[PDB]
Xylose isomerase
Amino acid sequence: NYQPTPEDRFTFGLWTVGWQGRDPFGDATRRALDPVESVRRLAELGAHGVTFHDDDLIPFGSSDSEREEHVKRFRQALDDTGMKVPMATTNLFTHPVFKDGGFTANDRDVRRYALRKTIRNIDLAVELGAETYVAWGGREGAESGGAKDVRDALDRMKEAFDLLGEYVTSQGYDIRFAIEPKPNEPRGDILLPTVGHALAFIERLERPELYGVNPEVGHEQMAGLNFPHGIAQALWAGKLFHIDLNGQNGIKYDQDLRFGAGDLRAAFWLVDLLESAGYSGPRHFDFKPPRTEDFDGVWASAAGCMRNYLILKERAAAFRADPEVQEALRASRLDELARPTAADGLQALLDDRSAFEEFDVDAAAARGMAFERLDQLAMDHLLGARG
Amino acid sequence: NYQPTPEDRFTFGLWTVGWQGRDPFGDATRRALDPVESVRRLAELGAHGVTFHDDDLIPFGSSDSEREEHVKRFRQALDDTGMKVPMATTNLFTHPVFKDGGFTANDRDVRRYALRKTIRNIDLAVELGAETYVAWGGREGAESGGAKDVRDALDRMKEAFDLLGEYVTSQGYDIRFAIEPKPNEPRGDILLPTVGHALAFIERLERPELYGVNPEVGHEQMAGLNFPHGIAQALWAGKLFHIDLNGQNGIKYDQDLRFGAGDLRAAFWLVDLLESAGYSGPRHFDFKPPRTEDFDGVWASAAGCMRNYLILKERAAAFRADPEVQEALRASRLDELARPTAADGLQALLDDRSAFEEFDVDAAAARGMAFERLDQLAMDHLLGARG
Amino acid sequence: NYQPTPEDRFTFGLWTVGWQGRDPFGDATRRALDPVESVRRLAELGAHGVTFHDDDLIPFGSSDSEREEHVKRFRQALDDTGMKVPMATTNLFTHPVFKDGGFTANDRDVRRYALRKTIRNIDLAVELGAETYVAWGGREGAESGGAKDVRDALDRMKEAFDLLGEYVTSQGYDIRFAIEPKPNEPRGDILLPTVGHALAFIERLERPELYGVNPEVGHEQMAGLNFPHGIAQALWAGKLFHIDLNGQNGIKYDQDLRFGAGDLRAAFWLVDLLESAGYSGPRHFDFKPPRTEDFDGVWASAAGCMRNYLILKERAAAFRADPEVQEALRASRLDELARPTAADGLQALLDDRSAFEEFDVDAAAARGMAFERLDQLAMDHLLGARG
Amino acid sequence: NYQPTPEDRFTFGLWTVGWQGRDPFGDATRRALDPVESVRRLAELGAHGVTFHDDDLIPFGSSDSEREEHVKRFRQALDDTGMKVPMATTNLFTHPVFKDGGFTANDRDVRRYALRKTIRNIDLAVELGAETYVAWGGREGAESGGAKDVRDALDRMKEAFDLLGEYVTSQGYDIRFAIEPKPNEPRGDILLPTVGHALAFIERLERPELYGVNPEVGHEQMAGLNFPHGIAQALWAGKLFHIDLNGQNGIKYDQDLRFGAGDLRAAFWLVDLLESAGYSGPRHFDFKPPRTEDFDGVWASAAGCMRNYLILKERAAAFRADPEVQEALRASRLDELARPTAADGLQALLDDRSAFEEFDVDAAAARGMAFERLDQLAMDHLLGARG
Ligand SMILES: OC[C@H]1O[C@H](O)[C@H](O)[C@@H](O)[C@@H]1O
Ligand SMILES: OC[C@H]1O[C@H](O)[C@H](O)[C@@H](O)[C@@H]1O
Ligand SMILES: OC[C@H]1O[C@H](O)[C@H](O)[C@@H](O)[C@@H]1O
Ligand SMILES: OC[C@H]1O[C@H](O)[C@H](O)[C@@H](O)[C@@H]1O
Ligand SMILES: OC[C@H]1O[C@H](O)[C@H](O)[C@@H](O)[C@@H]1O
Ligand SMILES: OC[C@H]1O[C@H](O)[C@H](O)[C@@H](O)[C@@H]1O
Ligand SMILES: OC[C@H]1O[C@H](O)[C@H](O)[C@@H](O)[C@@H]1O
Ligand SMILES: OC[C@H]1O[C@H](O)[C@H](O)[C@@H](O)[C@@H]1O
Ligand SMILES: OC[C@H]1O[C@](O)(CO)[C@@H](O)[C@@H]1O
Ligand SMILES: OC[C@H]1O[C@](O)(CO)[C@@H](O)[C@@H]1O
Ligand SMILES: OC[C@H]1O[C@](O)(CO)[C@@H](O)[C@@H]1O
Ligand SMILES: OC[C@H]1O[C@](O)(CO)[C@@H](O)[C@@H]1O
Ligand SMILES: OC[C@H]1O[C@](O)(CO)[C@@H](O)[C@@H]1O
Ligand SMILES: OC[C@H]1O[C@](O)(CO)[C@@H](O)[C@@H]1O
Ligand SMILES: OC[C@H]1O[C@](O)(CO)[C@@H](O)[C@@H]1O
Ligand SMILES: OC[C@H]1O[C@](O)(CO)[C@@H](O)[C@@H]1O
Ligand SMILES: [Mn+2]
Ligand SMILES: [Mn+2]
Ligand SMILES: [Mn+2]
Ligand SMILES: [Mn+2]
Ligand SMILES: [Mn+2]
Ligand SMILES: [Mn+2]
Ligand SMILES: [Mn+2]
Ligand SMILES: [Mn+2]
Ligand SMILES: [Mn+2]
Ligand SMILES: [Mn+2]
Ligand SMILES: [Mn+2]
Ligand SMILES: [Mn+2]
Ligand SMILES: [Mn+2]
Ligand SMILES: [Mn+2]
Ligand SMILES: [Mn+2]
Ligand SMILES: [Mn+2]
Ligand SMILES: [Mn+2]
Ligand SMILES: [Mn+2]
Ligand SMILES: [Mn+2]
Ligand SMILES: [Mn+2]
Ligand SMILES: [Mn+2]
Ligand SMILES: [Mn+2]
């Protein structure tokens, strides 16, 4: 049961299963994985494809010829396995040159370099067939208030994305950008810290249609935000281009637990919303097998990502299909929420005495919402306890 | 020193100093304040003006004759003191009818009622000279995941704000709207939980130019976010129509401490930003004197709000004027951040070898940012260890 | 399925199902419940018993004769239904006199009054057969740093509990005290903010054996702490006298959701630990049906508390009984954790070359912990997805 | 002004200024610092001393001859500067062997190794003149609920500390132990997560008088707790053996900002408490110059730590000396808090009608606490708006 297949569109970053277990207080506990090994093992587990930072696939500082060779080996593995590369991204955070940012470094020469590094890898992404190009500005921010004028930083962020827009437009590429928010870590505060801030920003870009969000479960949870609500907003705006799935236990460092771990109920409501909305993008896992684990545990953790998505999918489908839930949805007036408030228009509203002068506010107030019964059906479904 | 005058544009909600001290675990510790007394006492302390919810000024359910009497008394005290009313707002949260929201209540009739109640108060705000009308959707949200389809709720929110914009335009009113975010409380999760989410939503409205944000110090802090950063993004977008100033000690219930209390450094960096940016709107305090206090403490706390703003203004000004700080700003390349990355344009960037093949990435990486020195000069100035 | 009965030892505060829905931003949405009604309805749902604050059962300020009458009616209901009263507590937080605390009010006359109120209700608790007397110092704390010398406050807290100890000892009562931690709300910071701080404090009391903790799921979660870890510590110390069960979604105001809601996985690990440890005290629900609900929803929410405990119990028992989990526990060396580190003693340890000079650190390092596979079995069990 | 001198007892970890800037998302930005250089540079800035983990001073795996060489060089620099070594500690977290803990690793052999590694360094700490030996159980904990039986882990922790106490007693060493709490990071939840939990644990040890706490400003803040309150509880218990001073901006990853940065008011109230209490231990900074910084910024940040302590000391002293503050303290009844509730004893309290039947609860309730005025005088003093 719950065996994933390519139809489920599960993808993994090379850096996920490849994470060697180095944390701020600890050395690596696992050897480096060859990207080819990761492609084959994930394919065997039922993955649809993989994603990469430039520097995951090609060691920083490789010559043109070594770079060709890294890419060729990886392509070969993709071809043998049928694995795809739906997304790609830039490492603008590891090299010490990026210590104050890539696109919003105070040093202009660094910001230019950030863009050139990005553009080179956009060409590679396109060659590999990537439809989304993720930007995570992990170094864009500050630890102190006078280090970063955030209005200037946003000008430079806009300038950078606008230039990327012009680049992909000039080349005739079908690739869209997805901005991945995170509120802090490894900067004290990161710019565009949440889905909202990234959606807002995108509207000020010269070609806003080329840009969307790549939200991450744990990142919105590091600001204590409701992740399914934020995905709903992104879907309402037409901007959910990609998603990173994982787990997180509240407000703390970014844990990057396998999906289903962390806030299990929020995972449930998330699957429900994505499936209800018909989200057709990759179900991409950005997680890290804990450094406690050997390679067998790495693969178990990867497999558990996909397993939990499928169990949740089944329970959410069973919840939405249950006629008793559908009656509960009516009792709670979810159907009334979907009706326009005033299709009759402003003047009709103002002339409607029953909306104000004759509104019996106490009778409306007395109506229970029936949300707890609804939510207990949802719980019973999640837990497969439908009595 | 630090005596506020009405030119400082300090305003207060009636519900601030008028808070009777009822919290979820306790009864009122103070008697109701007549709004006349609030107006007079705040003017004597050097306030510029007051703001109100409809229900602070006119108790819910008042007859027309009671309404006229409450407004007449309030108008006389405004007259007598010279106090302005720059902002007003609707209470769409207290009354049991609003338990599932106003604009996004699942019941349609409640949504229409919310709109009518709002509209009525827009008229009154205009009569009193308000330039901004705030919306705080405190009840818009959910405790449980099935209770609220967030995409439908956002359709309903957009409808409501669009109708309000249609109303003010049809009436020829100069007033603009400001959305005040809050992440949670009294709902488990509130819709448009942060400055980013509200900013993004506005761009989807029919007349986006009529709508900005009214961010609150404590509310962004309740999501663990950087409030000065949030304000910078609002200013960058042209959307800082109004602000609520107060204090909060991290991620917990909404404390509404006096301005200056809570995160003092963030208060410093906020004042620096507002004053640097030439923000010309009201410096509005949304705070609650703690229920420990009697009426004499109410006034002390309100005076404290204004005094802290002025002390921090002086310290920020001394910081910016210090020749050591200016040299520090240059050593930290804040001036370079303000300049374009690639005003030579995309093709010149792509052709610039110094941006990529010939960029000495180790030399750039080795150059310290000098942020700690800069930040210590800021601390020195804040603490008055430099004048 | 999952029908609760008195054998499950589920209890409810009168104030839980009786909460009228007043929050800091909202009026009551439900009428007051008669305590007799609450006793009968809970009995019908399969509850074992009820708990009370003095002021839930007897309106503050009742005369001796009205007080007798309130108590008599309640006793009658207990007798008809067979409901018990295993715990009782004092309201030292609602009346404005307690605005700076009961036991640690700065005013000495208030602290004395706090003790007299408490002692009167301890006599009533005993008469009703209560074995635990809970203290929740919801008002003990501060909003500002100079208001409360916390060393003095702790002296006064110790003095108060020591006097209560002497009282119950002098009267020959079999009643034990359980201190309920909460980190903040309605004070900015509450004294003894966590299980740890309360356990620590108890060790400085004159008769520490008379005192334990009454931890609450949501309260430890408001400090972002692992609730099952804290219960484990309390059980390790012999101090888990009582427990409050409910749900909470991270770090925010105290939500008091029905149990199972909030952090569902932490609910699972909690049930597992309590059942594994043979906790024999009440399974007491301190929750509040959301103010969205009418009385039918109040009773559904109460019923869902108990239902979720039973589902979780079943899954946790199935997890612990599964031989495949037992092999996984061995693979992860949980059994080795339970063995003494050095029963051979200090000198033997120092003479053991294989523990240091000849310890192959790299071979030990290479061993995977197998925790992810273990945890995925736990997930599969929780979700009833054992494939 | 505010030049530190060695009498101020300011100490620094080698790992503080020596931090090379490697974080989970980035490589080192600074070269390794020779501990000799750290000792010399900190002495010139007016430090009192340094502290170390075994592995900071002697790289993991050093031969005896390398060990002697590293220690000789360090001893000469201590000699040359007059710098003390008041505290030392074990690195039981970096090496992959410690991935599931040292003292509470599930594998027994790892636990024994942790103890032997610790013991060896206790000898060295004593040789260098340390009075305190810190334990920080950074790896003791779990990511998942089944991985760690917390009751068994606490049996193992107690065993370990008891063995260490047996060791120092058998050797006749004057050294005492201090447990440093942290709630999470690098483990999902760490055991003994706060000051309270560590304090409670100590009372269960065989020789509790040998053990206190080494609380860290940022660590308690990572649970959203009040650090000055935590310190007051440690002082009240006689257990504040050592302290780590730094800064943190709320609930997130461990920032380790310089002291003064982060929550400035909490830093003020901490200094007031330490100085009022006559705390005589080291003022130890556990901070990391941000990786943005070069070596000149490293020194600026370290100097900033000491300077902020001294500025805050002066401001707290001026606050306590101000005649208006003294009157404010009396108006707020801080003096009454310091006096007993009922030194007349239980029977006199029970017989005192003024404590109950005849207590005028409305008059007491009406008396304001005047905390806001007091707190504004504190703000004035902190900001230098009063001298
Ligand atoms: O206190 C934290 C720091 O101390 C130790 O030196 C570790 O080796 C370092 O990597 C760690 O992050
Ligand atoms: O953007 C690509 C990825 O970059 C880094 O690995 C991040 O830590 C991550 O969350 C992100 O999803
Ligand atoms: O930081 C604020 C300054 O930089 C901004 O990004 C704007 O371009 C400029 O007009 C403003 O005055
Ligand atoms: O009643 C006060 C409420 O409405 C106002 O618009 C406020 O800014 C919001 O913070 C608050 O709770
Ligand atoms: O901003 C918050 C306050 O504003 C309004 O006056 C409400 O009536 C009050 O109860 C609320 O808590
Ligand atoms: O102590 C009894 C109860 O008192 C109050 O109702 C609290 O808010 C609660 O959590 C506690 O459990
Ligand atoms: O606040 C600190 C003072 O109060 C304490 O609780 C002690 O009893 C006293 O010795 C100390 O000096
Ligand atoms: O390496 C630094 C580590 O060990 C020390 O004992 C520290 O106080 C702790 O905060 C830290 O991470
Ligand atoms: O420091 C703890 C580290 O552990 C992880 O959560 C993976 O288990 C990383 O995301 C993090 O950097
Ligand atoms: O002050 C109102 C309070 O009364 C209670 O019922 C306590 O008996 C609490 O839940 C509620 O918060
Ligand atoms: O103007 C009519 C209103 O005025 C009052 O009489 C004042 O006492 C209200 O009770 C009534 O509805
Ligand atoms: O001191 C004012 C604040 O304190 C509380 O009463 C605590 O529950 C809040 O509701 C309010 O914002
Ligand atoms: O303010 C929100 C209120 O709602 C509750 O969570 C119950 O649904 C209360 O615990 C809280 O006071
Ligand atoms: O700098 C180390 C980093 O390298 C990555 O693999 C990115 O490719 C990240 O997960 C990790 O944190
Ligand atoms: O003292 C022996 C040690 O000294 C070194 O030779 C220094 O280069 C080490 O490699 C060796 O183990
Ligand atoms: O600036 C020092 C701090 O910044 C980080 O590098 C961010 O990941 C932390 O690990 C460290 O405490
Ligand atoms: Mn399938
Ligand atoms: Mn990128
Ligand atoms: Mn600027
Ligand atoms: Mn969790
Ligand atoms: Mn992440
Ligand atoms: Mn991600
Ligand atoms: Mn809103
Ligand atoms: Mn604070
Ligand atoms: Mn607020
Ligand atoms: Mn506000
Ligand atoms: Mn510019
Ligand atoms: Mn049963
Ligand atoms: Mn009590
Ligand atoms: Mn004192
Ligand atoms: Mn949750
Ligand atoms: Mn609670
Ligand atoms: Mn409780
Ligand atoms: Mn420990
Ligand atoms: Mn801060
Ligand atoms: Mn730290
Ligand atoms: Mn530390
Ligand atoms: Mn005393």
